[PDB]
Amino acid sequence: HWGYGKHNGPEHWHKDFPIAKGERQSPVDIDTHTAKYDPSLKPLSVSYDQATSLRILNNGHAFNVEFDDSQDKAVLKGGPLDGTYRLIQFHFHWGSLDGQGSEHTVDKKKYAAELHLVHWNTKYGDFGKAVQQPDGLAVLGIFLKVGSAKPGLQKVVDVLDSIKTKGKSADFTNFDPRGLLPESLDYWTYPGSLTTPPLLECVTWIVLKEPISVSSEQVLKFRKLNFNGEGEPEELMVDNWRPAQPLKNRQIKASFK
Ligand SMILES: [N]S(=O)(=O)[C][C][C][C]C123[B@]45[B@]67[B@@]89[C@@]1%10B81%11B698B746B814B562B%10%1143
Ligand SMILES: [Zn+2]
Numbered sequence: 001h002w003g004y005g006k007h008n009g010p011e012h013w014h015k016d017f018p019i020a021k022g023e024r025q026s027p028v029d030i031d032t033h034t035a036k037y038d039p040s041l042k043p044l045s046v047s048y049d050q051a052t053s054l055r056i057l058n059n060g061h062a063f064n065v066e067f068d069d070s071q072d073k074a075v076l077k078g079g080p081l082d083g084t085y086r087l088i089q090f091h092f093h094w095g096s097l098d099g100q101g102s103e104h105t106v107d108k109k110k111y112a113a114e115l116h117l118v119h120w121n122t123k124y125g126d127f128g129k130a131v132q133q134p135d136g137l138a139v140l141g142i143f144l145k146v147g148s149a150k151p152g153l154q155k156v157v158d159v160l161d162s163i164k165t166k167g168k169s170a171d172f173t174n175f176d177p178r179g180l181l182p183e184s185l186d187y188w189t190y191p192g193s194l195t196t197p198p199l200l201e202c203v204t205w206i207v208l209k210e211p212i213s214v215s216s217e218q219v220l221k222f223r224k225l226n227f228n229g230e231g232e233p234e235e236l237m238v239d240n241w242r243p244a245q246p247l248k249n250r251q252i253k254a255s256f257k
Pocket of ligand 2: 116
């Protein structure tokens with residue numbers, strides 16, 4: 001099945017998922033001098049004070065930190081969004097080297113990694129129904145550069161040894177995702193898709209301008225994860241990013257001047 005290798009990677013996905021060649025695919029290159037400032041855009045509202053993490057999972061493509069989304073707790077609203085979107089999970093995409101790893105690019109710059117905080121539109125009742133809708137998800141994307149450590153990331157880094165291989169999970173309670181945010185909530189936004197199969201065109205993308213800094217040691221520990229299951233030949237979980245896709249005349253809007 002699909003993955004990130006030479007034989008099953010992004011250039012192959014269209015054979016099982018023909019929407020891969022669709023009109024609103026993600027990620028994209030963000031051309032900062034073509035993105036227009038939109039004074040009608042609102043500040044983003046990120047309300048994570050009551051977020052309740054449950055578990056961390058290696059799904060063979062990345063690791064997901066999962067949240068209890070049974071009540072109205074950790075929500076994203078404002079910005080370009082109508083209504084309220086509930087946090088379900090976050091995950092990352094990263095490289096084999098510090099020069100690559102992000103999915104979105106900024107004037108063709110690749111960051112070392114990219115964090116995706118995934119939220120579903122509460123008007124559709126659950127995530128499975130939301131992904132069938134053009135406004136079903138809002139994904140908050142945050143770039144990572146290598147420099148100073150991110151203290152709020154370390155709890156995640158430290159549990160990775162316990163989920164090395166595909167299908168392993170571990171309890172992961174009381175993790176506060178506020179510790180992964182940069183200082184500024186300035187953003188770009190555009191309509192797009194999931195960046196992994198099934199590539200559904202259901203996402204309002206909100207990409208923060210300000211990267212977070214993580215240490216070399218932190219990202220090195222991401223690169224010790226495995227795509228394979230326990231008892232299978234080791235293949236390091238690196239370069240789990242889809243490259244930029246055609247913009248197809250979509251407009252990217254900026255919240256800032
Ligand atoms: N990389 S990304 O931020 O565009 C979303 C990555 C996985 C998308 C999924 B959607 B909901 B949850 C997870 B499971 B289920 B369906 B299934 B597809 B995958
Ligand atoms: Zn993602």
